[PDB]
A paper describes a structure:
For rotaviruses (RVs), which are the major causative agents of life-threatening gastroenteritis in children under the age of 5 years and result in 453,000 deaths worldwide annually, recognition of specific cellular glycans for initial cell attachment is mediated by the distally located VP8* domain of the spike protein VP4. Although structurally conserved with a galectin-like fold, sequence-wise VP8* is the least conserved among RV structural proteins contributing to a phylogeny consisting of 37 [P] genotypes9. Our crystallographic analyses provide the structural basis to explain the unique glycan specificity exhibited by a neonate-specific bovine-human reassortant RV strain and its parental bovine strain, each belonging to the P genotype. We have shown that P VP8* exhibits a novel glycan-binding site that adapts to a differential recognition of precursor glycans, which are the core elements of HBGA and human/bovine milk glycans.
As in other VP8* structures, the P HRV VP8* adopts a galectin-like fold with two twisted antiparallel β-sheets consisting of strands A, L, C, D, G, H and M, B, I, J, K, respectively. The two β-sheets are separated by a distinct cleft, which constitutes the glycan-binding site in the VP8* of ARVs and P HRV. This cleft is noticeably wider in the P HRV VP8* than that in the ARV VP8* structures or the P VP8*; however, the width is similar to that observed in the VP8* of the globally dominant P and P HRVs. For instance, R101 in the VP8*s of ARV and P HRV, which is critical for glycan binding, is altered to a phenylalanine, whereas the conserved Y188 and Y189 are replaced by glycine and threonine, respectively, in the P HRV VP8*. A distinguishing feature of the P VP8* is that glycan binding occurs in a previously uncharacterized binding pocket and the binding cleft is noticeably wider.
Author numbering: 65 to 225
The structure:
Amino acid sequence: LDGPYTPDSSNLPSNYWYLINPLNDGVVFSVTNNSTFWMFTYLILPNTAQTNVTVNVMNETVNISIDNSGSTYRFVDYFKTSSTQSYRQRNYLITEHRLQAYRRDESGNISNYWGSSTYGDLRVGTYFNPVLNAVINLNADFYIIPDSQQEKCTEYIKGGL
């Protein structure tokens, strides 16, 4: 819709969907308030055997295991809620397209798509962990779709550009 825009980090406005279309796998999204929420999304390519990988995200070194082995992409969310904690895997998106999208509401809650494009179980999920006014890192090219057109965003997630 509006875009494409190059990767960027900033205090993104609320009530917009940022539809990311990543050139690269790995970390494509991240945000933290450095207090009670750290979140990133890792893009796993198709046919990825089980691998332990080390990434640098928001000034921390992180070790995670990734597995796909499917024909489809997997966008996997990770989060932790205290500094000394390790990140744990949470929800994920299985999809034949290089698309995931993020929205922050007026309370600071991050939403993104969970489930799949393939299986008929696509959901708008929310992590009820406010990070209002935190910088959001979009490590991907992206489009911007207003909340009023949320239905259109879902169509791209499910169907591709």
